[PDB]
């Protein structure tokens, strides 16, 4: 299958990228260098992951060594919730660009639809633990994102963790200048997202699946939790195809015309996870994997459930 998908901005996006959430700063530079050496051309980043400087060291070294050209990379980062105010969006982007040592991003996403009070804290809290919101709304944040396209800092803009009513809000924005190119959302056999995906795709918005392996290193994992990598039913599909379970979990979203961004800092697993272009899941396999849906989310957060734009009350 083709390795890139066409976006509504006219550019092509690698359907496999390397995730970097939780990648330790002392390990992520080698992880990204390895990833580039074994074929990855898309890296998924965010300011809030607190490791963009070290990701950028790897990107810069591989451009300097002429392993890849900048035009061949697809680098993505995200606007954190404490920077949704108009006046803060450019600087937040510029900080990410400086850390990543780039002069443009291929894609910049609103990380979450929820804006928070600006300041040093990523999750500003009131005395009872609720996140303190920003009154800026998401349409004004979108316009500020549009300005970054028109200033040359980013080639595409998009959104992340937006539910279909919030996607619709952007699409219906008065005076909309650029549609979102991507909506990046959690997606795996336990959270198959058929409704949201169909909606986005119907509107020409490409979807990126995050936590495709079920984020087994998520800080809040509990023992009683489902585990994709250990699901005997997924293992059996992998064994049938002579691939690992992870390879199946990565190939699954690819065949739904999604982009997917598995994370690893383990060199052998970085390589393993890229070796997913040499086999196909049958339709039956795909429908079987879709059948494991249980609306189970890695990424949900109680401190933000009262925010007016919290995305996961809505059915989708
Ligand atoms: N937009 C957002 O709100 C959002 C939210 C969550 C995630 N994301 C993005 O999506 C990326 C992926 O999601 P994620 O980090 O939550 O989790 P994930 O990719 O589902 O899982 C990563 C975990 O799987 C392990 N792993 C990787 N390859 C493996 C393999 N072949 N076999 C067995 N274990 C393997 C990794 O271990 P090692 O690293 O130790 O090898 C790590 O513990 C993130 O890193 C981030 O870039 C975006
Ligand atoms: C969950 C959750 C998080 S997170 O789990 O810290 C996260 C993980 C990874 C990542 O990339 N981004 N955030 O931050 C949020 C901010 C707003 C809302 Cl409404 C929900 C959340």
Structure tokens at 49: 């992951």
The torsion region of residue 242 among left (phi > 0), alpha (psi -120 to 50) and beta comes to left
- Tokens in use for 30? 């080698």
List Cβ neighbours of 59 (8 Å cut-off, separation of 6 or more). Answer: 32, 36, 43, 73, 75, 100, 101, 102
Strands 74-79 and 12-14, by their bridges, are unpaired
Do residues 176 and 202 touch, judged by C-beta distance below 8 A?
Answer: no
> What is the token pair recorded at 73?
């990379």
Rounded to whole angstroms, the Cα distance separating 67 from 149 reads 28
Residue nearest (by alpha carbon) to ligand 1 atom 48: 210
Residue 40 known to be catalytic: no
Locate the DSSP E strands across 25-178: 42-44, 74-79, 107-110, 157-160
Per the document, the length of the chain is: 316
Helix 194-202 with 164-171: angle, nearest 10 deg = 10
In this structure, whether the domain defined by 1-316 belongs to CATH 3.20.20.100 is answered with: yes
Please report, for residues 15, 18, 46, 207, the alpha-carbon distance to residue 43 in angstroms, rounded to integers and kept in the order given.
11, 5, 10, 16
DSSP 67: S
Tokens of 60: 């810069």
Distance, CA 211 to ligand 1 centroid (Å)?
5
DSSP category for residue 131: B
Tell me 204's DSSP state: T
The answer to whether the beta carbons of residues 111 and 46 sit under 8 Å apart is yes
| Residue 115 CB contacts under 8 Å (≥ 6 apart), including other chains | 81, 82, 84, 85, 133, 134, 135, 136, 137, 138, 141, 309
For ligand 2, atom 12: residue with the closest CA: 111
Closest atom of ligand 2 to 112 CA is 17
């Amino acid at each position: 299958m083709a390795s890139r998908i066409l976006l509504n901005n006219g550019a092509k996006m690698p359907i496999l990228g390397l995730g970097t959430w939780k990648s330790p700063p002392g390990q992520v530079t080698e992880a990204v260098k390895v990833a580039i050496d074994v074929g990855y051309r898309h890296i998924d980043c965010a300011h809030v992951y607190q490791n963009e400087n070290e990701v950028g060291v790897a990107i810069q070294e591989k451009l300097r060594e002429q392993v890849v050209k900048r035009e061949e990379l697809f680098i993505v980062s995200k606007l954190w919730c404490t920077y949704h105010e108009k006046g803060l969006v450019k600087g937040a982007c510029q900080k990410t660009l400086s850390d990543l040592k780039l002069d443009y991003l291929d894609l910049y996403l609103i990380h979450w639809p929820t804006g928070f009070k600006p300041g040093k804290e990523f999750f500003p809290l009131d005395e009872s633990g609720n996140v303190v919101p920003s009154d800026t709304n998401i349409l004004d944040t979108w316009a500020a994102m549009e300005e970054l396209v028109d200033e040359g800092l980013v080639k595409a803009i998009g959104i992340s963790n937006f539910n279909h009513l919030q996607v619709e809000m952007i699409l219906n924005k008065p005076g909309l200048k650029y549609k979102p190119a991507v909506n990046q959302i959690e997606c795996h056999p336990y959270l198959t997202q058929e409704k949201l995906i169909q909606y986005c795709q119907s509107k020409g918005i490409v979807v990126t699946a995050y936590s495709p392996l079920g984020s087994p290193d998520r800080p809040w994992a509990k023992p009683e939790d489902p585990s994709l990598l250990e699901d005997p039913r997924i293992k059996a599909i992998a064994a049938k195809h002579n691939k690992t379970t992870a390879q199946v979990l990565i190939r699954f979203p690819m065949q739904r015309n999604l982009v997917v961004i598995p994370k690893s800092v383990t060199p052998e697993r970085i390589a393993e996870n890229f070796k997913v272009f040499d086999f196909e899941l049958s339709s039956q396999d795909m429908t079987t994997l879709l059948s494991y849906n249980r609306n189970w989310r890695v990424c949900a957060l109680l401190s933000c459930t009262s925010h007016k734009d919290y995305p996961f009350h809505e059915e989708f």
